[PDB]
Design an enzyme around this catalytic site. Structure first.
Site, short mmCIF file in Angstrom:
data_model
loop_
_atom_site.label_atom_id
_atom_site.label_comp_id
_atom_site.label_asym_id
_atom_site.label_seq_id
_atom_site.Cartn_x
_atom_site.Cartn_y
_atom_site.Cartn_z
N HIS A 126 -10.11 4.39 -3.04
CA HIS A 126 -9.75 4.41 -4.52
C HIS A 126 -10.53 5.24 -5.28
O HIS A 126 -9.98 6.01 -6.18
CB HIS A 126 -9.69 2.89 -4.93
CG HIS A 126 -9.00 2.02 -4.05
ND1 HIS A 126 -9.15 0.66 -4.39
CD2 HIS A 126 -7.82 2.19 -3.15
CE1 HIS A 126 -8.25 0.09 -3.57
NE2 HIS A 126 -7.60 1.07 -2.64
N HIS B 275 0.67 2.23 -5.11
CA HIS B 275 -0.66 1.94 -4.52
C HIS B 275 -0.86 2.53 -3.11
O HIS B 275 -1.99 3.34 -2.87
CB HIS B 275 -1.02 0.47 -4.17
CG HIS B 275 -2.49 0.28 -4.04
ND1 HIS B 275 -3.65 0.58 -4.73
CD2 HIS B 275 -3.06 0.24 -2.77
CE1 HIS B 275 -4.75 0.64 -4.17
NE2 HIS B 275 -4.47 0.42 -3.09
N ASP C 288 -3.56 5.42 -2.15
CA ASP C 288 -4.31 5.23 -0.87
C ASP C 288 -4.29 6.73 -0.18
O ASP C 288 -5.51 7.17 0.16
CB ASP C 288 -4.20 4.09 -0.06
CG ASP C 288 -4.65 2.72 -0.45
OD1 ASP C 288 -5.44 2.65 -1.08
OD2 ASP C 288 -3.84 1.77 0.34
N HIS D 48 -4.51 3.95 6.19
CA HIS D 48 -5.76 4.47 6.55
C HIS D 48 -5.75 5.13 7.98
O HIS D 48 -6.27 6.31 7.98
CB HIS D 48 -6.75 3.51 6.16
CG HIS D 48 -6.84 3.05 4.89
ND1 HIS D 48 -6.70 3.78 3.90
CD2 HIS D 48 -6.85 1.36 4.37
CE1 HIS D 48 -6.68 2.72 2.80
NE2 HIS D 48 -6.69 1.63 3.43
C1 RFN Z 1 -5.35 -1.90 3.05
C2 RFN Z 1 -5.24 -2.07 1.63
C3 RFN Z 1 -5.17 -3.48 1.21
C4 RFN Z 1 -6.65 -4.02 1.03
N1 RFN Z 1 -6.61 -5.40 0.77
C5 RFN Z 1 -6.41 -5.92 -0.58
C6 RFN Z 1 -6.58 -6.94 -1.03
C7 RFN Z 1 -6.49 -8.09 0.12
C8 RFN Z 1 -6.49 -9.74 -0.24
C9 RFN Z 1 -6.82 -9.97 -1.46
C10 RFN Z 1 -6.53 -11.25 -1.92
C11 RFN Z 1 -5.91 -12.13 -1.08
C12 RFN Z 1 -5.39 -11.70 0.08
C13 RFN Z 1 -5.56 -10.38 0.49
C14 RFN Z 1 -6.81 -7.66 1.35
C15 RFN Z 1 -6.68 -6.31 1.81
O1 RFN Z 1 -7.13 -6.08 2.87
C16 RFN Z 1 -5.55 -1.00 0.62
O2 RFN Z 1 -5.43 -0.86 -0.62
N2 RFN Z 1 -6.68 -0.27 1.19
O3 RFN Z 1 -7.12 0.63 0.26
S1 RFN Z 1 -3.23 -1.87 1.83
C17 RFN Z 1 -2.59 -2.09 0.19
O4 RFN Z 1 -2.99 -0.55 2.23
O5 RFN Z 1 -2.51 -2.89 2.60
ZN ZN Z 2 -5.95 0.59 -1.35
#
Ligand code: RFN
Ligand code: ZN
Length: 299
Positions: free
Chosen positions: A78, A237, A241, A264
């Protein structure tokens, strides 16, 4: 000519790691030309520096993690997305712990830090990497592709298979510039689904995550009191990423990225696939800024 830029001033912030739940102090500093973004673990003795480069991505489980030996810097995506969005070529990012703070879950707080510190133009040509031919990667039901484009376009398609989406695949495309990054991407928060809590618990992940810094979805709905910032915040989002993960190439890309449920891991594999195809890309600079392919904010 189109020039490299860094930060004008030092600026600090405090937060918590999304995955570790650990408090961390962050300091952004100017850096010299051709440095790129470099993370520095100032809690360690000796201090360990890790350049934010694709070749240093050692783990990609729910974040992008930079690794040098036993030392890690987690969740760099981010921040890096904000550096890419504002055209910050060179900077040091000092951290007191192994994970960048999650802040509000988006790149908005990093746009605040960068714009408040201000930008400093440097007397060196900015080098871009231009996509000459299609390159792709695919792992199961996920795929990521680069194709030529004279600018930077980030497209994404993902079917989350959850009721909040009303049975609709989520799709978005951003014609990247600093202005479209600020407007369309920067404020899109990270998100999680309660269906994934057992997985996260088992891996000791998302310890710092909650409705305070993420969109949280239960079996039926978004739990966040104020709902979504964008109707398409989830796919926006995923684009945020991808911009941060792609910036690990070490240079701004002139091309189009298309993501199909990618994350990722695949983003990093696409960079390694592209890098290896030596004839699919080239390095370019711009003597005449009137032919610039990407619009960046002025300092
Ligand atoms: C890989 C992610 C997501 C990161 N990410 C965010 C939030 C939560 C989470 C928060 C509260 C309750 C339950 C789960 C878990 C997690 O792993 C990303 O934003 N990475 O930067 S994604 C959106 O690509 O899946
Ligand atoms: Zn992210």
């Amino acid at each position: 000519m189109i020039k490299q830029r860094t930060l004008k001033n030092i600026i600090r912030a405090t937060g918590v790691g999304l995955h570790s739940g650990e408090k961390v102090y962050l300091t952004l500093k100017p850096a010299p030309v051709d440095t790129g973004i470099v993370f520095s673990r100032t809690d360690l003795d000796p201090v360990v520096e890790i350049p934010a480069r694709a070749e240093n991505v050692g783990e990609t489980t729910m974040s992008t993690t930079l690794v040098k030996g036993d030392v890690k810097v987690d969740t760099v995506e981010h921040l890096l997305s904000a550096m890419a969005g504002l055209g910050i070529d060179n900077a040091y990012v000092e951290l007191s712990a192994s994970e960048v703070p999650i802040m509000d879950g988006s790149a908005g707080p990093f746009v605040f830090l960068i714009q408040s510190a201000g930008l400093q133009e440097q007397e060196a040509a900015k080098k871009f990497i231009r996509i000459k031919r299609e390159v792709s990667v695919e792992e199961g039901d996920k795929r990521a592709v680069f194709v030529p484009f004279d600018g930077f376009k980030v497209s994404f398609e993902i079917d989350f298979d959850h009721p909040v989406f009303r049975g609709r695949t989520q799709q978005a495309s951003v014609d990247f510039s600093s202005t479209s990054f600020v407007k369309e991407v920067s404020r899109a928060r990270t998100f999680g689904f309660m269906r994934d809590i057992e997985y996260l618990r088992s891996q000791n992940l998302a310890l710092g995550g909650s409705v305070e810094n993420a969109i949280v979805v239960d079996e039926n709905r978004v739990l966040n009191e104020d709902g979504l910032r964008y109707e398409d915040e989830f796919v926006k989002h995923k684009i945020l990423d991808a911009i941060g993960d792609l910036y690990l190439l070490g240079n701004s890309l002139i091309g189009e990225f298309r993501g199909f449920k990618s994350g990722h891991a695949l983003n990093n594999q696409l960079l390694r696939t592209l890098i290896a195809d030596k004839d699919a890309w080239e390095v370019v600079t711009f003597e005449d800024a009137r032919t610039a392919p990407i619009s960046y904010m002025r300092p």
